[PDB]
Design a binder for this molecule. Structure first.
Ligand SMILES: Nc1nc2c(ncn2[C@@H]2O[C@H](COP(=O)(O)OP(=O)(O)O)[C@@H](O)[C@H]2O)c(=O)[nH]1
Ligand SMILES: Nc1nc2c(ncn2[C@@H]2O[C@H](COP(=O)(O)OP(=O)(O)O)[C@@H](O)[C@H]2O)c(=O)[nH]1
Ligand code: ALF
Ligand code: ALF
Ligand SMILES: [Mg+2]
Ligand SMILES: [Mg+2]
Lengths: 656, 656
């Protein structure tokens, strides 16, 4: 005898519904039942019409004040159906859903709930009474055509899916009853119009492409019933209701099987809760008020115009890439441009929703940040490259002078000097330095690691020259007395500093390249060694070597005097001193040796052009220590006795 | 007897209005007139109510079909006013504006016109009848509360401006007549509600901050009049109208002076056209349908979710900066990510307005382009720096070998090689190469213009060494015969190749640095010249110089023989040959000269440390050509006769 709210004001679907339903009619409800519901604008007399036509007891508006009355959705079982025969029980149990009216002013702006309940109803009912005033007929929003477009649409997008499966589907009947009908305009005429309005709604909706072909008739039947002014024509109203009672129970011309999705009642109670879950929070159904939606557009409109006012005003400071830059002149010109647009946007948008206005302010800020960044970046990089040059220069300008320790301060100062010089033009850190600083650091590391190769190949080189100096010289100084211990004093130096190489180096290392800083150095000694030999001693300076010795006793006495000859005994006794004094270093220097009499071999397989350019030959190895060739060797002693003896009897003329 | 449309359906304000108005009442209309208009939902019986209450002849809907009837806005002069005394002429001329009803279905979606005409009316009238059905009272959009919020708002934002100027302003009367009033609910009750609804509308509007303080009462009076069912209560309707006739003409309780903005009628005809201009196209009034506004939101919602689906799926390919890059592997992974989001966006947004959907597709594309660009850029630059290294290397690796002509092909190939290698990863040119290519070119130009300085300071250097070789050597070779023409053969070479310097160079020039490639070169000769002199001839190798000559005749004969002495006449005749043969080149070489006997001066003011480091001294100039000093000069001839004569009588011991 009392109804219940299947779904209360705040969207709570009800738990005790099945229980309730079965406790109303003591009959077993099995698949013997109809679901009928009502939809329309606030206070169109719906709770009244259910009450009067089924015989329910939904509250109705007390007429003292026009106000919302039905809240949420309600369900009651119809005892009897008022018909022209008076009251009449029906075969089936008739379950009637009273749904809160649309477009009330209590909830003016959040049409949240109306859309939702309108779709439960539509989704869950065999027959839906669309309850309108005649005077809503040619209306658009006043006939709820907006609300409807939505509701149907989601209905298709959310359960026009189930089908091609041949129920007993939900075709639902759209039972459209016209209230306060005067008669002046024929219902058949009202009907034409409003079905047209519904056909149009149908073409107007978003359709998932699988269903794009689907029509309104496929999903829905429509019929009509007019009802006279209840207050001013009480009787004609009453008869009109009864006439409608006969329509559904007596003639049984309304309900058909197709509406009834054909399962026991518990199946429905379930299908409902389900249907309500999928409705209560649906993405296509979530909507912000008109106001927000309006503010959004309003605010973009401005974003663009203020921005367009930002653009061709910046196409004018920066078409020209500045000649004479200043990062405090710039970060200011920047702040100022951003200041203009804001205050102009603000002048026209602070009216609207603060949040939308705010959301849309931030959007503009970063539209103009990203146009300011472009310029910031340009200069900022123009700066790096300049500085960097100086820095590269700076490195070179201190050859090897304590590398690692100068790398440090210098590289620091760069990074620091950029950070500051460029932070002045970034607008409260709005425009980022991170990517710039990273790209700088990488650049520094690229440079040092190339200045390092230049200092590490310089130390190799400028070490091979304090070697070549002390080396090719303490050859000669040694050579003014060819001893048992020349080589004993020669490689004792050749390798006395062929190690200290050169001490550590102080550059940043490369350890396994610090180490291979030497295997060029050590290869190049074993390359210049041979080259000094093949240059100090050759066919040319060898023939020459004879006389440097030759004269010291064949033309000189006992104390540095040019020998005073005595007999041709003294003339032909000091002639043979030289024949040896011009043969007696060759065993110290034919093929070059060591105080051990064993051959000298090179550290590396040179004479081969493959190990060669890693640091920039006949049959065997045109041998390393082969200073004087195949013969060239004895081509000196074909001349030993030609020139030297063109002096022995050729200077005999001076005893006469 | 016929009205006219001040503004037709499509917004054309009418030209012949003043003329029309004056031709209606033969009375002179001067400031003796009222402006009264009607506002409300389609077919609320407005044209009917004007007709019945003033006695006009606006068409009315023929009841065969519910449809729009009044189109645009109309104006007619009221002959008489129906009142309870029957018909009554009034003192003032009453000008009545019939405005097309809101919310018709003929124009369902474009509320353009209704907003506009609703605001003309409100802006232009002393009294505005808001004509509603009782059954619209507790409604929101069905009571037009949306349309209104707008209309008032713009009204404030567009002419609540004029004021603080103390007219006779437009307070306008809001004359709200309730149609088909049954009586069940007291008009006073309806009134309370609906004025409340209007107060709320008032708090709900955008207000320019100057006016934020302004209230609804400041701008507007409201009163009410109920009217019974015209068809079902013809008489009570009639009496109700008459009762309203008495209200404005008999009691004269409606019109007040404050509504009347107090100027002659032509002033009004003007104020109207003006008001209509500022309305017909106003920015706050320009609006897109609900549908678009809805699609916009709908489509952003998706943009974000599809994008968020793009982001943390890319935070996953690129958190890790790739180790092993491939630009065809990449431009593909890119296209594919962009492919996913699209087809997912498309799967959910192709429903809505194509244009909004399209607009909003493009928006997503470039959201993801700009996230793809970041990665494209990274690698793309990783590529430039690698290549560049090779290129820098490549330049150096061809010392001077035809610079300009190798600069060309090499620099081309780089640019080309980048363009191609990086175009493969840009997505149909969506992501730009322009800024990359520019930054490359600048980089190339930075490098060559530094390799050039290295090749141009090398040619200076390695030219000063084929000079120093032929130079310090054809000194000595010349010096084996100190002639009248030594210097004649010495600077003839010193400046024989101190010009060809060195021929053109073939590098890219710097012309006025190609030219200053030499004013180092020419300065450094005038620097090494002096250095060779101060090194070949000094205290050391000078004392030495004596004997190189000394021996050739004091110890040698006529053909290369060591002189065979004869008498102590032959012993002390060839002793004085040397005293000169050891003094007779000094006038060829004390201070160094020219075959003219004039001093040699340097090209540059050297000995001064200021012109110095532009290419890396006592009282006068510790003179340029001062090879042997203050004395050092005669410190050789304190020893001339010590060592050389420790040989004349010291080798006299060999005649015994
Ligand atoms: N003019 C008119 N008034 C009605 C009619 N039916 C009911 N009313 C009254 O309209 C008011 C609204 O009724 P209610 O049934 O509570 O409307 P709901 O909110 O749409 O359910 C009540 O005062 C009813 O007495 C009708 O058919 N015509
Ligand atoms: N129920 C009712 N019908 C009316 C009333 N006044 C006029 N009508 C009818 O309503 C229809 C609309 O009239 P019209 O005056 O052309 O309306 P408008 O478009 O708002 O100007 C006409 O058929 C009128 O006969 C009324 O007060 N109540
Ligand atoms: F007031 Al209602 F449905 F319109 F309860
Ligand atoms: F049909 Al109308 F104003 F509502 F002409
Ligand atoms: Mg109700
Ligand atoms: Mg009309």
């Amino acid at each position: 005898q009392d109804a219940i709210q299947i779904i209360d004001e705040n969207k709570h679907f009800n738990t005790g519904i099945l229980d309730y339903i079965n406790k109303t009619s003591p009959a077993d409800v099995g698949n013997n039942y109809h679901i009928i519901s009502v939809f329309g604008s606030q206070s169109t007399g719906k709770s009244t019409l259910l009450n009067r036509l089924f015989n329910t007891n939904f509250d109705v508006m007390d007429e003292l004040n026009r106000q919302q009355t039905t809240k949420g959705i309600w369900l009651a079982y119809s005892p009897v159906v008022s018909t022209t025969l008076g009251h009449t029980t029906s075969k089936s149990n008739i379950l009637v859903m009273d749904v809160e009216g649309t477009d009330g002013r209590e909830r003016g702006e959040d049409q949240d709930f109306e859309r939702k309940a309108a779709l439960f109803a539509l989704s869950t009912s065999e027959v839906l009474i669309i309850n309108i005033w005649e005077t809503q007929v040619g209306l658009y929003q006043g006939a709820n055509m907006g609300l409807l477009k939505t509701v149907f649409e989601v209905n298709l997008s959310l359960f026009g899916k189930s089908k091609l499966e041949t129920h007993n589907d939900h075709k639902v009947l759209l039972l459209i009853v016209i209230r306060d009908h005067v008669g002046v305009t024929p219902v058949e005429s009202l009907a034409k119009t409003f079905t047209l309005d519904l056909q149009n709604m149908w073409s107007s909706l978003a359709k998932p492409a699988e269903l794009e072909h689907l029509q309104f008739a496929d999903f829905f039947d429509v019929t009509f019933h007019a009802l006279n002014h209840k207050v001013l024509q009480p009787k004609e109203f009453g008869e009109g209701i009864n006439r409608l009672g006969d329509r559904l129970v007596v003639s049984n011309e309304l309900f058909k099987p197709e509406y009834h999705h054909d399962v026991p009642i518990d199946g429905w109670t379930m299908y409902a809760e389900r249907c309500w879950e999928q409705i209560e929070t649906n993405k296509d159904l979530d909507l912000p008020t008109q106001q927000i939606l309006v503010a959004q557009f309003k605010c973009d409109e401005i974003v663009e115009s203020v921005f367009q006012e930002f653009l061709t005003k910046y196409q004018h400071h920066f078409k020209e890439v500045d000649a004479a830059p200043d990062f405090e002149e710039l970060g200011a010109l920047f702040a100022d441009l951003r200041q203009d647009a804001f205050e102009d946007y603000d002048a026209s948008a602070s009216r609207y929703n603060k949040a939308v206005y705010e959301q849309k302010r931030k959007k503009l800020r970063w539209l103009i940040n990203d146009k300011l960044k472009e310029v910031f970046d340009v200069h900022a990089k123009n700066l790096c490259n300049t500085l960097l040059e100086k820095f590269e220069k700076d490195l070179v300008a201190l050859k090897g002078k304590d590398f690692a320790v100068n790398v440090k301060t210098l590289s620091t100062k760069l990074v620091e000097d950029v950070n500051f010089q460029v932070s002045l033009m970034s607008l409260q850190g709005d425009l980022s330095l991170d990517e710039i600083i990273l790209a700088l650091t990488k650049d520094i590391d690229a440079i040092v690691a190339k200045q390092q190769v230049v200092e590490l190949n310089s130390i190799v080189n400028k070490s091979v020259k304090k070697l070549s100096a002390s080396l090719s010289k303490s050859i000669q100084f040694e050579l003014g007395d060819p001893n048992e211990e020349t080589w004993d004093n020669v490689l004792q130096q050749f390798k006395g500093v062929y190690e200290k190489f050169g001490g550590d180096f102080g550059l940043g290392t490369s350890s396994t390249q610090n180490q291979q800083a030497i295997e060029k150095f050590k290869f190049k000694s074993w390359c210049q060694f041979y080259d000094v030999t093949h240059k100090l001693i050759s066919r040319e300076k060898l023939l020459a070597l004879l006389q440097d010795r030759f004269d010291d006793k064949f033309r000189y006495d006992e104390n540095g005097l040019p020998k005073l000859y005595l007999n041709e005994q003294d003339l032909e006794k000091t002639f043979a001193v030289a024949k040896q004094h011009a043969l007696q270093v060759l065993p110290i220097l034919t093929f070059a040796k060591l105080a051990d009499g064993s051959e000298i071999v090179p550290d590396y397989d040179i004479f081969d052009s493959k190990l060669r350019e890693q640091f920039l030959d006949d049959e065997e190895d045109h041998c390393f220590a082969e200073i004087i060739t195949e013969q060239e060797k004895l081509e000196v002693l074909a001349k030993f006795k030609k020139e030297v003896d063109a002096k022995y009897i050729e200077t005999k003329r001076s005893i006469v």
